[PDB]
Amino acid sequence: EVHLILYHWTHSFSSQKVRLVIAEKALKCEEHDVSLEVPVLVHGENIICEATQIIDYLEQTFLDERTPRLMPDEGSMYYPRVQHYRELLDSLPMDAYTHGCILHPEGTGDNVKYLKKILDELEKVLDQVETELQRRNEETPQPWLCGESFTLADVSLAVTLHRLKFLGFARRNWGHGKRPNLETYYERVLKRKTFNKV
């Protein structure tokens, strides 16, 4: 029971990731929606910016047995694998699918080529995730992406999937015969109560 402050943009993608971690870790936090772009966490005299650095801080700093851990031990068996999927998902340029990376009309020729690149990049990441979720299925007599416990890889995936639904990508990328494990996963995430709150 410590008093954290979080300054965020309530509809931003970074904000949803950080607030989900904070809900999962069951931490008290006074939230300030400062919209009118990258989040800021204050913990007494410590001031941490950017979702990934805020989340890493929250994991290292709150070691109380009462607060759950979203990661296994750094020398544990499956830490490298969870770190791998969390970085994979966190590398997707989620803000770039709508407009690309060049907005001026005079770079349309190259913007559409960049949009192809990242959209092919997105297809492989989701394909890689769907095989991993099948491997988990083939070992269930129920587990999340990397193992039995909800994890930072699952935080990045739940929010990444929610974000892709919002942008109109879900219909062509899971359900209706396509990537059935992702559909089940997203359906399970929506019912989780920490995610529902955000």
Instruction: Give the number of domains in the chain.
Output: 1
- Provide the pairing of β-strand 46-49 with 4-8: unpaired
Residues 159 and 89: their CA atoms lie apart, in Å, by 10
Which residue in 188, 119, 118 sits closest to 158, CA to CA?
188
Measured CA to CA, the distance from residue 152 to residue 154 in angstroms comes to 5
**Rounded Cα–Cα distance for residues 158 and 163 (Å):** 9
Say which residue the tokens 């739940």 belong to.
Answer: 158
Burial of 109 (0-12, 13-18, 19+ CB in 10 A): exposed
Pick the closest to residue 68 from 185, 191, 194, 186 (CA basis): 194
Residue 119 burial (CB count, 10 A) = 12
Do 70 and 24 touch, CB atoms closer than 8 A?
yes
b/e for 16-42, b at 16 or more Cβ within 10 A? bbbbbbbbbbebebeeeeeeeeebbbe
| Method for this entry | X-ray
Encoding tokens for residue 65?
């047995």
Which residue segment(s) compose the domain that 130 sits in? 1-198
Structure tokens at 137: 């299925």
Residue written as token pair 């920490």? 194
Residue ranges with strand state E in the chain: 4-8, 29-33, 40-43, 46-49
Residue 20 three-state SS: helix
Strand partners, 43: 46
Residue indicated by tokens 């990397």: 146
Backbone angles phi, psi at 91, to 5 degrees: -90, -10
